Amino acid sequence: TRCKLKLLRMERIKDHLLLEEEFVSNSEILKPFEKK
């Protein structure tokens, strides 16, 4: 019950954080196109 609630709070800030990070990280401007 309660044990389950404690976990919800963490799972919803992990997803959010990741999603935002991801834009940059994947690229969107990084655009490797160097010689290799």
Binding site: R2, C3, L7, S25, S27, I29, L30
Partner: protein, 906 residues
């Protein structure tokens, strides 16, 4: 129906099949039509109240839908009634449950939002008279037992949760937040919370922490405090309520900001002290680190029984386990004043008894002279060192050591690391001093430095026995001005007395060698030596170290490595609280350099600890910025750039760890889950992030003390055979080490065979072989875990050698330091009062991976073992007391605690 002839009490009966609807025109039309009829409605008020009880006897949606048709509209100011100020006020009481019914029990979303406001006023206004208290009370206490009350009482309190949440959501708070539109604190609402809480500690286990956390304040736990202290024995037994407290506090506490995060712990500590069980309470005393608090609990344990019995033994052992040793010194003097025995108590508070129990254990695990390592080149150096690592803890390897051949056969700086590692054979024990002393007098400057470092490593088994002090040996070599000799020696002092505060330690270290006068890297070790002392207890955040960091950093910044040593040291010193680390964060930030900002991030990681709200987000805005600078370009000066980039990567993992240790166990799985996805993201993002991140990832796994120890470590290791960096093997393997011959059985075969095979540089070979051999422990010889004692997520004191040196480039000078790995793990023995070694029986559950244990309540299934056993990280940890055969009660009640057992055997 709504008719103005259904007002009568004649039609109670005829109606009541369908649903009572006598009430409907009785509080609607009569109120409007005449105000003589409000007084008439008062005489009818008694009938109307009993109808509510009848409609809660049979709980069905039909008889709530059907009853109300306009009881919902009419409340007080609907009908423009306010006449005789008393009458409509008493008429709030019947219409209040009415609304609650149509909000939820017949499911309807719109009514939840809209009437959330209406309802909260009605409760606030009438609770001031204290006659809403009385309406609530008759369903709370269930004198008449039915289904109705069980959902009605939930509603009343659902609304209160609404009222305190208004503080959290907006600064406007109070009335001005109209989700309720009723203040969080008044002279009518407060008297409602308390009354509800007393009754509902009995009826529910989970509505009470709901109110606590959404309030997001210590105002919620003050009202609870007084309530719990009333409810503690009479309503339900001391042990059962004690369970309720430990649940409640851990749910509310991770959320809250740093000044109040601590406040919830002071309230919990004080509850625990009051209740008979102080086993939990001693734990809380470690966390705050206030000297005052350890004195209070410790005395509370000793004062009830004026003879040694269970009482003095219990007090002593609880302090012992924390091998910070800060507690031990505090506890001795109370015990020594009584003088039942002076010596046995001092020994048992002190770490002397922890040395002795291990001696018994070794015999079983079997004393080995076993060595691993190969001849020739840079492996000739290795093999020597490796004998040390393999003979973890106290072990007989006396005869191998007795040969001077092997020692003098080492070359270079490797000679230094050889003598230090002989200390690691004799780790956690005085005995084996004699071999080291020999080196200290004879040949090379190199082996003199080595002798001193190793004497450090060995003497760790004391800090409050005060039997062969570290200070006796170690003073003299500070005085010898040769930089190498002095450095080994003043670091040594730091390790041996560890966390313990003693006059001797302060006065040795009062002179520091950290200055611009020796540019030498090895002078930095004074401030690092200080860091041991402070940790494990509330920091002074000593200003001496700040002054010398700055001086040396500005003056020489050509050597990045010098100044990195200084920076991480201040960082380590800071562990244990964040509050005063905020204050000095300003001091450093005043002066600014590209160099300063390496410091900003590191000390910040300690500082902002006390919430994940700020901490987690912040160290990810920082991770983002490097990617952005590079992506733009796509579409002395060198020393500055390098430091910035490397520290940022390091600080990112470190912050995650600080968060997980302090906060609940749900956060460990969760951070780890961010972490793994995160690798792909940083590999994509940059070449430089790819290399560096590996090195810290094995340190994330270990410092975080991850639940899961199966699929993830093995994934990472396989992947980095190919990838650059072999320092990732070192960091990772110390996680793999904590459950011996399990994760590491794999490690040895895979890495140790392939490393030898594909060899194309001996330096790499050295790194791979050293990790792979270390990770294994011959037939489960002593393990080194992060756990300090009762803390298993405890702030490390002698295991932060990994934090220091994973960060900086690998070196031959590093190999010496890395022999330190002190923090051994006690067996679990049932003891009473005669200290009879080994356990009778205890439960361990070795199947743990669950992220839904967060209370701290053991998985009580176990599988029963009769052999004494070391406590295995997250694979052995849950601990139940089993000794019911001779009929016993826990005096020390386990919570998965590392602690040895104590029982009262009848």
């Amino acid at each position: 129906m709504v008719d103005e002839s259904d007002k009568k009490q004649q039609t109670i009966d005829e109606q009541s099949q369908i649903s009572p609807e006598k009430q409907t025109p009785n509080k609607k039309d009569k109120k409007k039509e005449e105000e003589e009829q409000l007084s008439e409605e008062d005489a009818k008020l008694k009938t109307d109240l009993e109808l509510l009880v009848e409609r809660l006897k049979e709980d069905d949606s039909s008889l709530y839908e059907a009853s109300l048709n306009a009881l919902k509209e009419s409340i007080k100011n609907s009908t423009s009634s306010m006449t005789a100020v008393p009458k409509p006020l008493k008429f709030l009481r019947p219409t209040y449950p009415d609304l609650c019914s149509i909000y939820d029990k017949w499911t309807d979303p719109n009514l939840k939002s809209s009437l959330a406001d209406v309802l909260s006023i009605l409760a606030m206004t009438y609770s001031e008279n204290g006659k809403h208290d009385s309406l609530r009370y008759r369903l709370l206490s269930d004198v008449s037992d039915f289904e109705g009350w069980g959902h009605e009482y939930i509603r009343h309190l659902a609304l209160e949760i609404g009222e305190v949440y208004n503080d959290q959501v907006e600064k406007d708070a109070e009335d001005e937040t109209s989700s309720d539109g009723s203040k969080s604190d008044g002279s009518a609402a407060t008297s409602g919370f308390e009354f509800s809480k007393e009754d509902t500690l009995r009826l529910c286990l989970d509505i009470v922490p709901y109110f606590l956390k959404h309030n997001g304040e210590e105002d919620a736990v003050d009202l609870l405090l007084e309530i719990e202290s009333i409810d503690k024995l009479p309503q339900f037994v001391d042990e059962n309520t004690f369970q309720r407290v430990c649940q409640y506090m851990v749910a509310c506490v991770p959320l809250l900001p740093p000044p109040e995060d601590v406040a919830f712990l002071k309230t919990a500590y004080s509850i625990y002290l009051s209740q008979n069980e102080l086993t939990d309470a001693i734990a809380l005393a470690v966390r705050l680190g206030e000297e005052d608090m350890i004195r209070s609990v410790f005395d509370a344990t000793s004062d009830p029984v004026m003879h040694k019995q269970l009482a003095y033994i219990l007090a002593a052992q609880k302090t012992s386990f924390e091998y910070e040793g800060v507690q031990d010194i505090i506890g001795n003097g109370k015990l020594s004043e009584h003088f039942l025995y002076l010596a046995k108590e001092l020994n048992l508070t002190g770490p002397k008894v922890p040395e002795d129990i291990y001696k018994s254990h070794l015999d079983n695990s079997k004393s080995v002279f076993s060595s691993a390592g190969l001849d020739s080149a840079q492996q000739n150096l290795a093999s020597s060192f490796v004998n040390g690592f393999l003979n973890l803890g106290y072990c007989n390897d006396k005869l191998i050591v007795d040969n001077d051949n092997w020692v003098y056969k080492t070359k270079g700086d490797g000679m230094t690391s050889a003598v230090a590692s002989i200390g690691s054979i004799y780790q956690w024990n005085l005995d084996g001093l004699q071999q080291l002393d020999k080196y200290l007098y004879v040949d090379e400057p190199e082996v003199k430095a080595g002798a001193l470092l190793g004497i450090g490593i060995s003497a760790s088994g004391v800090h409050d026995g005060e039997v062969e002090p570290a200070l006796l040996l170690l003073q003299d070599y500070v005085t010898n001005p040769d930089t190498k000799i002095s450095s080994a020696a003043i670091l040594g002092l730091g390790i041996a007395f560890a966390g313990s505060k003693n006059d001797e330690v302060l006065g040795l270290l009062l002179p520091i060698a950290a200055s611009t006068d020796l540019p030498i890297e090895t002078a930095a070790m004074a401030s690092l030596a200080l860091a041991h002392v402070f940790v494990g207890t509330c920091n002074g955040d000593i200003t001496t170290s700040i002054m010398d960091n700055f001086l040396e950093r500005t003056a020489i910044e050509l050597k990045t490595d010098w100044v990195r040593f200084l920076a991480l040291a201040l960082g380590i010193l800071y562990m244990g609280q964040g509050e005063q680390v905020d204050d000095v964060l300003e001091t450093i930030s005043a002066i600014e350099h590209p160099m300063t900002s390496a410091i900003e991030v590191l000390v910040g990681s300690c500082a902002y600890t006390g919430t994940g709200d700020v901490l987690l987000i912040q160290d990810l805005l920082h991770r983002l910025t490097p990617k952005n600078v590079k992506g733009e370009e796509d579409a002395e000066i060198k020393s500055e750039e390098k430091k910035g980039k490397s520290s940022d990567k390091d600080a990112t993992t470190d912050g995650k760890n600080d968060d997980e240790e302090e906060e609940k166990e749900a956060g460990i799985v969760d951070e780890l889950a961010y972490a793994v996805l995160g690798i792909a993201l940083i590999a994509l993002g940059e070449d430089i992030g790819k290399e560096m991140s590996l090195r810290h990832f094995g340190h994330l796994m270990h410092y975080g003390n991850e639940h899961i120890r199966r699929m993830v470590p093995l994934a990472m290791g396989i992947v980095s055979v190919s990838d650059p960096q072999m320092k990732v093997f070192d960091t990772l393997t110390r996680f793999s080490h904590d459950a011996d011959l399990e994760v590491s059985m794999n490690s040895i075969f895979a890495m140790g065979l392939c490393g030898a095979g594909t060899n194309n540089a001996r330096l790499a070979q050295l790194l791979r072989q050293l990790a792979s051999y270390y990770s294994r422990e011959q037939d489960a010889l002593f393990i080194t875990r992060l756990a300090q004692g009762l803390l298993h997520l405890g702030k490390g004191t002698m295991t932060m050698d990994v934090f220091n040196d994973a960060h900086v480039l690998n070196k031959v000078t590093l190999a010496s330091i890395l022999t330190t790995a002190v923090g051994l793990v006690s067996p679990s023995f049932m003891l009473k009062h005669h200290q009879l070694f080994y356990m009778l029986n205890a439960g361990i559950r070795p199947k743990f991976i669950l992220a839904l244990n967060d209370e701290g309540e053991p998985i009580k299934v176990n599988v029963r073992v009769g052999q004494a056993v070391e406590t295995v990280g997250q694979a052995g940890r849950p601990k139940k007391i089993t000794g019911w055969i001779t009929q016993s009660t826990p005096v020390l009640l386990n919570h998965g605690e590392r602690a040895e057992l104590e029982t009262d055997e009848y």
